[PDB]
Design a protein around this ligand. Structure first.
Ligand code: FMN
Ligand code: FMN
Ligand code: FMN
Ligand code: FMN
Lengths: 394, 394, 394, 394
């Protein structure tokens, strides 16, 4: 931290000695260049959302309709952007949201590792998807000293789900995010046009391929032993697909909580009574998301739901993602009451242009801007950033 | 059904064996490609609407301003999208809206037949226009086991109108839709620029040319017998035009109802007191439509009128069309209280690119998306999709 | 049919009674619309050529650098465009060039039969590829009275080769065209970018799966009998790929001449020594072609090669294709000494937009233009249109 | 590796099991994507040429004005594209041309090592620039069994020159290429507009900072010892600029031949007298090149100079670069008498998109196309592809 905004001193300082930037500085340039730098299947998969993508787009537009009220003569010369979440201190109110194909957003095929390493160097927590090229144990090592969270895609096999949760607790993950909006895949025209579904080609199934329950059950089903599977994951792509997506129930969440000491955080919550029942049932975190609009095109921007989710959540921490493109967006979601803000699409572009360093550049750019907005506009820390600081705007 | 969303499994499954899709997956691609695939007169006629087309466009824009609220932990793993309408069970809350030139949207000139056959294979009901290349008797056969409805353009000859209704009841049609907003043609710049009016060239007049009353009255008027007319329908285009468009009255609707046992459904209703008087007079169905904005450019999106039409309609079923482009749209209109949702322009593009199979692909794409939206967002059946599930959006 | 130019009076007669054309009237508008009416896989394969397609384009450009000299006061009010080829009288100095995926250029998937049907109606002869959806026996049937030719892709199996030739003879084809420039597929970036290759999916292999030799050999190689092959031709696709491409040798031509009475015509000849040597072999026809630039991007426009191929072939007829887009191109290549001119890409676009009638329209438009130019510019028949009527042009 | 053309069967085999390509398949799409995947400084420097870049463009255009004559019935079913150069057998008549910033064209900043690794896997020889990030000793190691060449930028310091040459010999390079057309940098508007010049920032100077002569001389001139130079090469950048560019003279060539056993190859020759005089000096190779139009915008396409440089050089091998974008260009320059052909800009785009594998893909695509053209058009080996197989074309 020192302050996050300091990052611009280094960019400007390097220019004075004839060293120009090598990466873009804004989302639009990140996206413009990344999309052309990626393979076409990956582009379709990462850029593409659900239906005509109105929701994915509305998520982003929502942020143009709040404004922060600037406060003069506050002298917010030292900012404190840290947040304490479930016992751990985060250096920044921001985290890498789960991205199951981030491995493939990077030219070397290890974008997930690259993401965890960027987390290690910045202190921006990495939330690893269940889908991945590096196993969740290797990820947690790459994440260093920085808090790391495990996002569970809950499978149709209780033994496997518990193996994932156990392995995550044993690997030293700091919390468990259960994604509630992706037990089945939404209608995605960009991927359907080219019949692009990479997991069914055996990509990003390392966490299944390495899991003892999956290995045992797939051998029972196919005759294939653990070595043959690891050498050709695609052999178990159809088996993966059959068990991948369990539709999670309230009773499931009570079960998960009783078998692990990790805090449980539910991702996909939009409705305040869903947030109410979760919190009243002892769930530890509420993660307001609509999955980037990638999974259902119902039209409701995530950000429209965050205020009532915050109120219903009470002192239970609320995470927010879906539509964050800049540091401005990050400040506005924090002001509405999110404790920490997830970053998706922007760091996938980071990966496409620069690997671990590109990801690190996105994270640091987003936080520099947020911190400089708080300084100029007179908010010295996140406790002072309250929802009454924002104003609706045409 | 099984579930309609299953359709995407087949697309993805075929790609895994090197079989790419051959048709588009989204409305914008349907429209972009269809419009270039059609003859220029047909394009002008099918794409074109009334005046500067603000209404046609506003119909579609309206849907961007409602959002479905996602419900988590509902486990809507088995969806029931069936609807019972006037005694018959529909497998889907969706139907092919009447399109008088759909015959000509297909390269082989039999787009109407093609539409009825797609209905037969999907269970999406076909509503055949009075205007058509296949006679209403052949259509009903092509429709198989699937409910089929007859849309009457009520002529200025009571004998003819009753012949159409009798023939439709005898052919086994399951209801009668009287279109109230097209007794006279609205100002249509795209067609006027090129003086394109295909019916006056004797196209799509099969139901008149085959009708005994029309044959008798046209011979009385012209001397032409039934064979000469059937070999040159254009001989009776001017006669058709003189009788085509009777302005329907309340008393007419009471007359129609008393001469047939088919349920009567009125299409074009926008105003709730019009819906009130209809329903209080015993009409069986209310079909909220503004005819795609093709006929009057007054500016009122159909969807803006559907909520008050639903309330005034009570337990009388309400059909909705005008502006549906995607499965998202379909869910939102159902949530507002329509019992079934009509599809227009999208399946005309289906016909232009793939005939009966293209039409079937549009229908199945629309329903897959709607069903997957209901699953992800936690609505298990249409009874659970209530208007309070929607939220207005900027 | 008094002269081909009369076709225009039909198009103008119909507009006078308000019947507008439904198909485009120039190659540019056929290509534009047709390319949007096609599935992306068919588009890529039909439009795409070899390499960066310079040769494909340069083939077309070459026609811009010859001009026909108009001759006034010749009164060419009656034109004879007939040509006598191998003892049959062609109504038109034009033919449909072999296109192996033409079946798939038409929405109903039988564009090959539609091409034969258009040839039966126009008098424009059809040359069926070895690759097709309809058997070569049924193509000949569909071609009516119009002379029809069979284009052989000589396979790596003399038995199969001989059964193809004996079948074509027995089906009553009037010539055997042997394609010499596709025993191996060239670098085609459009298809490679999406790994598009329809034959390996068992598409268009009917002439192999109907063949008793192919059946026998494929059964020995796989255990699958003829009915199962008829119902899943893809079972045979890798076996087809193994024997498809035989690099034809001089001695093979000798061997083919001796087992058929059909005239043998060699397609792909570009160099005069190759032609002179063919003609001294006793080859019956020379088919000057570079396959539309689709197999090899060597850069030599096929038209640059025609004059010297005509001269080296003496009395033997020379057919020409590669770059013909209009009836002006037709006239020019005839003028250089082509006895008959082949159309490829234009009639594929015809199929994509009108099926049989779209194909017929392209053919009658090309011949209407060619005839009208001869009429206006003073060439009453093909004997008067010689290379001395052309001038090189900037 | 039976023939280079087989590469295409891999790309098509993978699509059949739903594995789509991830890299582009033509130069146009490499350039388009790659230019967007690069930092703007690398883009400017790699894409930019001298002046208004007419020469850079005209080098490429010249290949559009030669066409290869196809020869039918030659049965070139086995092709020999091998070439013997200075007592080593090249698997391919193609090599990676020297590119001093290739390291920076790859996201990991070691594109020079990745190029050598692609050469070790392909058999396509690598020519390392004097400018590089990896030492010339490590480049040779990375190149495995594949012949490797060292490109000398003769410095203004005979000691340093001689240590470079002795190092390359000792590292086991198989030739010394001396670049003659860059002892001073030309007017490059793209770099000048943003004052872009990576060497003066101490980038790509490893071969100088690893060099004992450079160290000694630079230490006398500044007091900085070798370790500090290793860690801040920019300390030496102005000193590098002072001795970089020596205008090589005839006597210098003489002096170089005498202190190495390596074959000496002169790069930049365009005029026949310069070549004839080189060959009579006893120079071992002629490298016809205008540096891709990057140093001087004089306007003469390098390809216009090759035929007469081949003739003036008699038995001495001639290498060719400048304008090669596809395998068609490769074939044409070989046909004019180039014994081997160099690739520049295409493999830089390869690095920017795939690193080593992107480079390998460009090289195998170029050679697949070249081979397939020879196969289709009847040239079984390089001895048969002569200038008499080409025709000038409009
Ligand atoms: C390519 C991609 C893949 C995704 N992968 C997953 C995943 O594996 N797990 C998950 O819970 N969410 C998934 N996310 C959703 C993110 O976690 C986050 O909800 C979303 O990206 C926020 O939307 P935005 O990128 O539009 O801001 C994915 C998002 C993207 C862009
Ligand atoms: C080309 C075309 C022709 C039409 N034909 C008729 C018809 O014969 N009968 C009728 O009641 N409505 C007619 N419809 C209206 C549809 O039944 C429906 O009201 C309308 O298309 C819905 O608007 P949308 O296509 O913009 O969604 C027509 C619509 C189109 C697009
Ligand atoms: C889609 C397509 C497929 C082809 N398939 C065949 C074939 O099966 N047999 C053959 O000898 N040539 C084939 N060719 C070459 C054509 O017969 C003809 O030589 C070529 O199309 C002429 O060039 P143009 O289409 O650029 O005018 C094909 C051409 C096209 C456009
Ligand atoms: C970015 C770049 C840097 C260059 N650097 C070198 C170099 O270090 N040494 C050299 O002899 N030539 C160099 N050249 C010239 C190339 O070796 C080759 O002659 C040239 O790229 C061929 O032209 P083309 O790239 O337009 O085909 C370079 C070329 C490029 C594109």
């Amino acid at each position: 931290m020192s302050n996050w905004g300091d990052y611009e001193n280094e960019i400007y300082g390097q220019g004075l000695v004839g060293v120009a930037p090598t990466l873009p500085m804004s989302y639009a340039d990140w996206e413009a260049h990344a999309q052309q730098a990626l393979p076409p299947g990956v582009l379709s998969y990462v850029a593409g959302g659900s239906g005509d993508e109105h929701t994915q787009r509305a998520n982003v537009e929502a942020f143009k309709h709040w404004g922060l009220m600037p406060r003069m003569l506050m002298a917010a010369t030292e900012r404190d952007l840290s947040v304490e979440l479930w016992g751990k201190t985060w250096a920044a109110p921001m985290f890498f949201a789960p991205i199951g194909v981030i491995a493939l957003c990077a030219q070397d095929g290890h974008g997930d590792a690259a993401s965890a390493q960027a987390s290690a160097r910045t202190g921006v927590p990495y939330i690893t998807s269940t889908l991945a090229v590096s196993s969740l144990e290797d990820i947690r090592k790459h994440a260093g000293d920085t808090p790391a969270y495990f996002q569970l895609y809950y499978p149709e096999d209780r033994d496997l789900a518990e193996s994932f949760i156990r392995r995550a607790e044993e690997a030293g993950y700091d919390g468990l995010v259960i994604t509630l909006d992706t037990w089945i895949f939404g209608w995605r025209p960009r991927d359907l046009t080219i019949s692009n579904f990479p997991f069914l080609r055996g990509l990003c199934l390392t966490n299944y391929v390495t899991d003892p329950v999956f290995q045992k059950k797939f051998k029972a089903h196919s005759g294939v032993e653990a070595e043959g599977l690891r050498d050709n994951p695609r052999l178990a792509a159809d088996f993966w697909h059959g068990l991948f997506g369990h539709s999670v129930t309230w009773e499931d969440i009570d079960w998960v909580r009783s078998i692990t000491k990790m805090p449980v955080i539910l991702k996909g919550i939009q409705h305040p009574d869903d947030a109410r029942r979760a919190v009243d049932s002892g769930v530890d975190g509420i993660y307001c998301s609509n999955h980037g609009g990638r999974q259902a095109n119902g039209g409701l921007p995530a950000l429209d739901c965050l205020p009532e989710v915050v109120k219903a959540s009470g002192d239970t921490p609320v995470l927010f993602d879906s539509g964050i493109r800049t540091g401005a967006d990050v400040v506005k979601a924090l002001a509405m009451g999110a404790s920490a803000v997830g970053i998706g699409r922007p760091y996938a572009w980071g990966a496409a242009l620069g690997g671990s360093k590109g990801i690190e550049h996105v994270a640091r750019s987003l936080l520099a801007e947020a911190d400089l907005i708080m300084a100029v506009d007179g908010y010295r820390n996140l406790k002072e950033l309250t929802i009454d600081a924002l104003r609706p705007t045409r």
